[model samples]
Target chain A: SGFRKMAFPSGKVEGCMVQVTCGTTTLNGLWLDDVVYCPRHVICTSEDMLNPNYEDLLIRKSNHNFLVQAGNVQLRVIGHSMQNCVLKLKVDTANPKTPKYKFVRIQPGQTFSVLACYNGSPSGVYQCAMRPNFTIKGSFLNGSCGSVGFNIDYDCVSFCYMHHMELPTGVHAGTDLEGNFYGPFVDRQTAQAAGTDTTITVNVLAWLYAAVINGDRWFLNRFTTTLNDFNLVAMKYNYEPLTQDHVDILGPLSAQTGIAVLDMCASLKELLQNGMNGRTILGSALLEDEFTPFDVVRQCSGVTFQ
Target chain B: SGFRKMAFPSGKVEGCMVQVTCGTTTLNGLWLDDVVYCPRHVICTSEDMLNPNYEDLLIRKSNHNFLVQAGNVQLRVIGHSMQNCVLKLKVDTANPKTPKYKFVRIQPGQTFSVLACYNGSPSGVYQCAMRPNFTIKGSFLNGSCGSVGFNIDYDCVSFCYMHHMELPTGVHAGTDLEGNFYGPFVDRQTAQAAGTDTTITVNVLAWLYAAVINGDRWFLNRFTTTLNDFNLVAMKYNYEPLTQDHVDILGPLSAQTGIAVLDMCASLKELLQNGMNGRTILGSALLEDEFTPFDVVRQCSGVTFQ
Candidate 1:
């Protein structure tokens, strides 16, 4: 009857114990509810009641209860956690076959969001997994965190296509010209568009036009070669001059796509004539600027055509 | 009276005097036919008759007779000149406002040609100057050496326009997008009809198509902004969403001279959609290559939408 008995909070007592003594007798046991009892004597302090290991267990429980919200290809950390933890966000899309992963450090009672694009995937719905890491007791949140898909317009698809094609390794479906490489030009435009730099676009456009002008010599040479080839082939076939039928046959052979050879020739002739006319027009414009006395005399004085 | 007289080549001997000698008696005077008379008694040896200065005069005379032949913007040294000379070819075209100058070295009895473009000048006539530079005496060749001008067709003009426009310092005319730029693009197509590098043209066309696709974002943004601005202005004026009257008025406000805005919009939409469709079609061609297992599953397995 010398020992005193104490009940545990949940009818269970384990591990470390606290002791109380009277006169020459001493008792030590784990505390249950408001009572404590034991057969051995042990000294207990307030530090014992607030054990560091016990605190970690409590933190892990609270952290496990934390929930993550997923929407718009973004993740938001919600709920209170007892310890500093990192939330790993994994996004899996269907098209690229490559999953995107991101990590966010979340403190207890704090909210954070991560926004990411699913590239050009038509269906924006991505399967997202958010796992919280708290040292050894880390665990993934419950349920599949699927968000409503964001519908991108045709423009976005175009953007993605441009984005991918601009890469050196991407499919080069469009560039058909042998001499003129459009890769650099397309890449510049792609960068400008994505950056929303319209000024650069204008500059590049002007440069592109100038390049076309400078390449005229090559263009002319090629043009002549083509014409000569066409004539030679026509003569060999006993055709007097290239006709629409001949042009049609030559069109595909020459990579003229939908147009006929003769039509193309006519068009080219017209373009050359128009370009000359434009230059003539441009000459008139330049005349308004500072003109030398000789220029005026030479330009204005009507000399007889020999 | 011991003097020997040498006959001059012609009636007039303007520059430099010749010396006549007879048995150690030399007379330095102007030669007239078979007579050389001078009041001063001068002793002249064979060396005196063969004057170094006199030899230079002879050389100058021969050089004066040298004529430069000009045809096809090229120069040919005609006639015999004793000394090697440089022929400076100056080509002045009315439109460019700047003359192109080139130096062609020509030796005696040798022929060389200088190649140059008339730069799409319509006059088919360019003022060319050929100045011959001799070590001692230099003179311009007599008569205007004219060459047959190269005629550039409309396509060439378009090509030039495109080339010039592409340059940073070139005429920004047709590139106005507001006015003259389309003129050039249309001209190019027109020229393409007349003169086609079907292969090169296709390549360039594909690149142009890709560029258009890439620019979709900027175009879309601008389109939306313009549409919104138009609507806002119309609403302020108590007008309906752009009608025929509005289009007719707005047509002049915008540089889209030949086509309607709605037509442009439709065309642009079709172009963008077509570009994407074209890529999808290209996928089949790419599929012929060794595709990964993942690619086959991702590309072909069409799962029904939930």
Candidate 2:
């Protein structure tokens, strides 16, 4: 009864280096063979550039599959070949919804190419389904045709709680949301369908923190003002019509990726000071303010929405 | 200083309902009239859906808001017309890349219609953005008109988090992988360009779950496998041919939304048998001996592979 946090709980893990070991059974007993460790990283490797081995890969049952009474152990068969084979491992799982498991069967002398995604699972639980554009080829055995072996290693962060979110059925061993988790805009007319309307409508919007931090490096602090305050003051004015001034400021301002931390701060300050019809300011308070407020601040030290 | 499993110290509880109550004036002696809640909630009352007074409704801010400490609470103004006004809770964070928030503005006396997403953050925290969608007709009002007399409820969920997922920089909180997320398969020979190649082709497949459970009811644990499982298995076989006949037996056993339990059990047994590889004879140690005597029973108890 092992638990895992992903679309599929196959033995393979994502984003971590794994150690794969090949083994064989003789008249005496089973013995471990060569140990190959695929670095726990994703990038375009030699396998991605060459179709070294594309044929003679077969899936088979475990020769000595066993379950221990208690231990965190996962054992599964990857792939095998009849010739002098070399096996390459990609992410694999019983759940096909996640990234599918792939392998390149190569002869000992042939070289294979592969492309890898390092940050495969952005979210701890949800695995991004990635398809590898791979071409594999099998070279004829050079000489000795012994028991061919192949294996791969991978390390994955366990998001066991996420499995409930993905597969909300069965006897999942985790906490369930007392109710559905909702945010500020969840209540608007758009968030809920009216009468028989099948569509859900919403008015409020949220930020993309992941892309900002990981991809763009943006951060934001809380302040109070109306949506209008943001438009008229800090950023671009969306009220009357798109004026030349608005176009000049808003167009180019709207085209960058990632977090625009300081840039956003400056624009927020300008809007708070000069954007409102009456008088209102929008700017982040000192980070020292332990109270990470979520409500709209009407009048603060240097800001006011009047 | 509370640590949350999902987020920061306070667990990033964004839109829990906070209400502003009309109690006393601020220390500065400014008369607090109409109170606004930071986030909005749905209030569907058969109690006079015909007539909803803006004044009669009471709005409360989240407990985290400072106004609660100030003793006088203000409902974050979404939108208000003497007749009807819509409220917005979330807005796009100040990121230039995604510079729009979508909302439906209704004028007085208008029929309901769909509103497309638009640009701009009109309010700083909780407020509407841009123009009114013609479909909804309700006069728009700014500031608290008079004594804001109304009883309001806050949605526990915040729009910020919901909107968060939609932003490009936010978490990809979507399910349709093949639709929005796509990839291509390429041969190694084509990868040499290190830039461009069309032979590396793309293939987008449909979700089998969608084909089966279109919200239709079906037996929970039955042998009459669903169109979802069937389609997926067939697709698997199509891509990699299966050698088992169980797939053949279960291939055509479609049922109306639901099926008989016994029939399902029998079918499942047959499928399992086929999957186990049609081994009619099994070893047993009953009849008071290390090896039981063989009996020529015609019972269906074997295994096969699918």
Candidate with the greatest lDDT versus the true structure: 1
lDDT of 2 by residue, A143-253 (tens): 101111112112222211111011112111111012111111111112221111110000001012111212222233354434444445423322121133332332222
> Cα RMSD (Å) per model?
39.2, 30.6
Q: A1-306 in candidate 1: lDDT tens per residue? A: 000010001100111122222222222222222222221111222243223243343344332232221213322222321111111112122212111221222211111111111111111111111111111101111110110111112112100100111222222211111112222333121222121111111111112222232332122222332555444543443223433443433333234123334434433333333333223222121111111112222222211111
User: Once superposed on the true structure, which residue ranges of model 1 sit more than 4 Å away at CA?
Assistant: A1-71, A75-90, A93-160, A164-226, A229-260, A273-306, B1-306
Candidate 2, residues B1-306: lDDT per residue as tens digits? 000001000101211222222232111111122322221112213342334343454344322222321223332333322112222222112212221222222221111111011011011111111111111111111211110101001211111211101112111111111111101211111221111111100000111111122221231234554534444443432321222332333233223224332334333333333432221111101000111000000000110000
| Separate DockQ for every predicted complex | 0.01, 0.01
Worst 10 residues of 1 chain B by lDDT: B1-10
Docking category of candidate 1: incorrect
Residue B24 lDDT, candidate 2, scale 0-100:
27
In the range B195-293, model 1's lDDT, one tens digit per residue, is 111111111122222223223222222233244544454344322344444344334313323433554443333333333322322212111111111
